[PDB]
Amino acid sequence: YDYTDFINYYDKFKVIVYNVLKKLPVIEYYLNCIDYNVKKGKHIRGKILVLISSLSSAYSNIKRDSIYLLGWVVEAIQALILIADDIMDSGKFRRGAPCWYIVHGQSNAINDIFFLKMLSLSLIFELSSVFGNDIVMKIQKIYNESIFFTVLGQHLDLSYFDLSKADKISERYFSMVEMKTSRYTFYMPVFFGLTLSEIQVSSAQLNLIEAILYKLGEFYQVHNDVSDYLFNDSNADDICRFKLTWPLQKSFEIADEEMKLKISENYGKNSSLVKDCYNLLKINEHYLEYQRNALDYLIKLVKDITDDSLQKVFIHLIHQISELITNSRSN
Amino acid sequence: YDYTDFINYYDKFKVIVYNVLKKLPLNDEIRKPVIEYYLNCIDYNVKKGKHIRGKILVLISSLSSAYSNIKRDSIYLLGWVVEAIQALILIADDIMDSGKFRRGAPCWYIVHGQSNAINDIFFLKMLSLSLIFELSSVFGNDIVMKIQKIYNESIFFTVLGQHLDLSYFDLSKADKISERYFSMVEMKTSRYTFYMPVFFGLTLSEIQVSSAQLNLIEAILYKLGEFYQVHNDVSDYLFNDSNADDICRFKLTWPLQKSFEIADEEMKLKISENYGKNSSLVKDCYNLLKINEHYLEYQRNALDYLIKLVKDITDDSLQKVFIHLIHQISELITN
Ligand SMILES: O=P(O)(O)C(O)(Cc1cccnc1)P(=O)(O)O
Ligand SMILES: O=P(O)(O)C(O)(Cc1cccnc1)P(=O)(O)O
Ligand SMILES: [Mg+2]
Ligand SMILES: [Mg+2]
Ligand SMILES: [Mg+2]
Ligand SMILES: [Mg+2]
Ligand SMILES: [Mg+2]
Ligand SMILES: [Mg+2]
Numbered sequence: 001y002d003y004t005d006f007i008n009y010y011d012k013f014k015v016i017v018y019n020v021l022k023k024l025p026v027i028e029y030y031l032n033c034i035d036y037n038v039k040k041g042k043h044i045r046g047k048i049l050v051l052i053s054s055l056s057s058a059y060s061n062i063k064r065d066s067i068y069l070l071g072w073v074v075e076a077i078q079a080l081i082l083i084a085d086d087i088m089d090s091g092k093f094r095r096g097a098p099c100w101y102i103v104h105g106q107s108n109a110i111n112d113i114f115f116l117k118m119l120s121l122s123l124i125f126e127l128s129s130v131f132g133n134d135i136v137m138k139i140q141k142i143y144n145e146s147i148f149f150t151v152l153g154q155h156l157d158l159s160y161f162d163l164s165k166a167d168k169i170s171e172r173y174f175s176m177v178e179m180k181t182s183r184y185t186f187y188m189p190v191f192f193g194l195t196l197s198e199i200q201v202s203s204a205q206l207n208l209i210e211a212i213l214y215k216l217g218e219f220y221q222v223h224n225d226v227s228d229y230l231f232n233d234s235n236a237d238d239i240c241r242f243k244l245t246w247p248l249q250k251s252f253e254i255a256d257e258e259m260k261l262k263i264s265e266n267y268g269k270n271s272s273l274v275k276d277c278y279n280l281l282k283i284n285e286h287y288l289e290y291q292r293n294a295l296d297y298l299i300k301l302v303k304d305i306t307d308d309s310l311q312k313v314f315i316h317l318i319h320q321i322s323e324l325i326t327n328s329r330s331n
Numbered sequence: 332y333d334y335t336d337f338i339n340y341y342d343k344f345k346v347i348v349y350n351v352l353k354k355l356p357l358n359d360e361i362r363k364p365v366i367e368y369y370l371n372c373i374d375y376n377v378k379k380g381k382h383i384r385g386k387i388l389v390l391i392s393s394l395s396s397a398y399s400n401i402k403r404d405s406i407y408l409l410g411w412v413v414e415a416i417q418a419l420i421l422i423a424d425d426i427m428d429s430g431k432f433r434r435g436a437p438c439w440y441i442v443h444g445q446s447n448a449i450n451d452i453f454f455l456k457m458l459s460l461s462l463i464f465e466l467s468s469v470f471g472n473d474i475v476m477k478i479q480k481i482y483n484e485s486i487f488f489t490v491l492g493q494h495l496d497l498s499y500f501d502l503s504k505a506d507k508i509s510e511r512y513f514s515m516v517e518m519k520t521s522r523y524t525f526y527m528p529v530f531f532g533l534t535l536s537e538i539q540v541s542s543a544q545l546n547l548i549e550a551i552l553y554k555l556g557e558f559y560q561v562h563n564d565v566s567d568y569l570f571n572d573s574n575a576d577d578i579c580r581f582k583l584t585w586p587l588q589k590s591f592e593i594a595d596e597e598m599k600l601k602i603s604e605n606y607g608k609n610s611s612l613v614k615d616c617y618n619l620l621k622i623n624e625h626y627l628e629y630q631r632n633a634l635d636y637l638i639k640l641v642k643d644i645t646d647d648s649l650q651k652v653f654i655h656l657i658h659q660i661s662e663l664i665t666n
Contacts, residue, residue, distance in 0.1 A: 026491055088446035
């Protein structure tokens with residue numbers, strides 16, 4: 001898909017950030033800050049905004065530029081969340097490049113989160129002249145609910161669980177995942193798209209596709225979690241960082257009372273032994289039947305969308321995310 | 332002014348906060364001591380302080396258009412929103428600056444760690460955002476969009492002001508040291524400390540249409556902002572001797588710029604070489620030159636220009652609010 005000239009609007013997006021910086025060295029700093037954190041990447045979430053904006057809306061106005069801007073606002077929102085995540089999680093690299101807090105220091109990274117946010121806020125606020133109040137208003141409500149949940153989701157990510165009390169530690173996983181990841185990644189860009197378009201209207205037909213974004217997000221984080229276990233070797237990984245994650249969630253689900261003991265002990269000092277078990281528990285295997293069932297259930301759900309115009313972009317959506325996750329390091 | 336009713340709204344605000352945080356249905360909500368984490372966060376960060384800016388907004392809003400009932404609570408609420416804004420800004424500032432105490436108590440980042448401190452900042456940001464969206468039902472959309480525009484402008488200026496505050500490259504030969512500082516300070520302090528609550532206050536009061544010399548008020552709040560920060564800086568030079576402070580941190584300070592207007596080529600080497608290495612020695616030159624001296628001259632002219640400016644306000648009603656403001660600020664600075 002393209003998505004071109006969504007990417008190419010970056011140029012025009014930079015100029016709008018540049019002209020907002022009439023306050024009146026710092027411009028150069030923050031222009032580079034957005035180049036480092038917003039320019040880099042696949043831009044999946046800003047891409048979800050254009051897709052949904054696509055069949056849903058009918059060619060009338062030059063809101064298209066405005067839709068692209070908002071597609072870059074979502075990218076700055078994603079970026080600022082990740083610069084904040086890499087600090088807490090002692091991240092080393094992201095998007096093939098050292099984390100912003102490493103190149104620029106922690107104090108500047110914290111302040112820079114504040115920059116992107118207010119930038120985000122300001123570019124939104126100035127979409128009133130294009131879609132008017134109602135649209136902007138409905139867009140700002142989505143924004144608030146999205147990040148609010150991500151923060152609480154992130155809080156749960158920081159809040160240590162009770163490994164011994166693993167009766168519904170899985171219930172704590174998915175809930176957390178819905179909070180921290182699922183919302184901003186999927187709910188936010190889509191609902192931002194649904195608004196700009198003003199699709200007409202299937203409101204009662206909104207929970208279904210809501211259940212779609214909940215699984216898309218679950219699926220996204222679940223695979224994120226396995227990759228770390230599968231390819232990260234360090235003392236600043238999920239296990240060495242004592243984090244509630246899909247492999248540990250499942251392990252406690254599949255393991256005898258003798259292996260869950262070996263994991264509770266070494267979590268998390270020796271990540272070595274924790275993974276040893278994951279292999280004898282064949283977690284990797286279990287994620288594959290997940291990945292498998294994840295796909296078709298989304299198709300099940302997709303096949304039920306009534307609009308038949310909303311189902312088109314949601315057909316691309318399911319594809320785009322699954323291709324992201326299955327066309328990885330395969331071997 | 333018997334600011335007491337506002338302070339007593341805290342319970343309703345906290346009720347309004349607890350009521351929102353209903354995030355999970357279906358289940359018994361076994362995973363919600365999250366609420367008890369953040370209720371504690373609010374008690375720890377927003378309840379403490381002395382609550383100045385909050386007061387400023389309520390004072391303003393009520394004084395240029397007094398509410399009689401109902402809208403008052405939405406003014407009190409916002410004033411508590413203001414407070415949660417200032418708190419989140421200072422939690423971030425204390426991390427960046429390695430602070431130890433705030434509002435009497437130990438810094439939130441120390442107590443709960445900086446991974447949580449950063450997350451908790453944007454809890455308060457997002458709550459404040461969603462709470463300011465609350466007023467829509469009471470004041471209307473055009474009044475909310477105006478609030479939001481003020482919120483944005485103000486925190487955005489502070490963010491770039493904090494960047495200039497963190498600015499690593501502060502060279503030797505600097506003539507713009509006073510320009511870089513007073514601008515820095517305009518951006519990081521002047522905007523949000525007194526502009527934000529006063530421009531919140533008088534959006535809610537919505538009175539009146541004075542547009543021409545409504546710059547005059549901005550010229551007062553600026554002076555008041557830098558006035559407040561210049562004190563903060565002096566106080567740092569005077570009242571601590573920790574193993575590491577504002578000079579151990581190469582921070583652009585008031586005792587540093589007005590020390591580069593009076594000193595000599597030779598003394599401009601003492602301060603330069605020992606900055607971020609030995610506060611004592613750097614404090615001795617300050618001492619020689621007597622920074623607290625010319626700081627007194629500063630306050631005099633600062634209150635002189637301030638008072639003369641307030642004599643020019645068009646509304647004798649606003650004028651008194653502004654005189655009262657500056658009086659409460661000057662004194663409070665003198666605590
Ligand atoms: O990419 P990362 O850092 O593995 C992660 O997925 C990024 C992230 C941050 C915030 C919300 N959701 C996911 P995390 O959750 O920190 O494991
Ligand atoms: O109270 P502090 O930390 O002395 C200070 O005034 C707090 C502060 C932070 C942000 C804006 N204005 C003041 P700083 O500026 O860090 O010296
Ligand atoms: Mg991470
Ligand atoms: Mg994490
Ligand atoms: Mg991960
Ligand atoms: Mg400080
Ligand atoms: Mg500071
Ligand atoms: Mg200070």
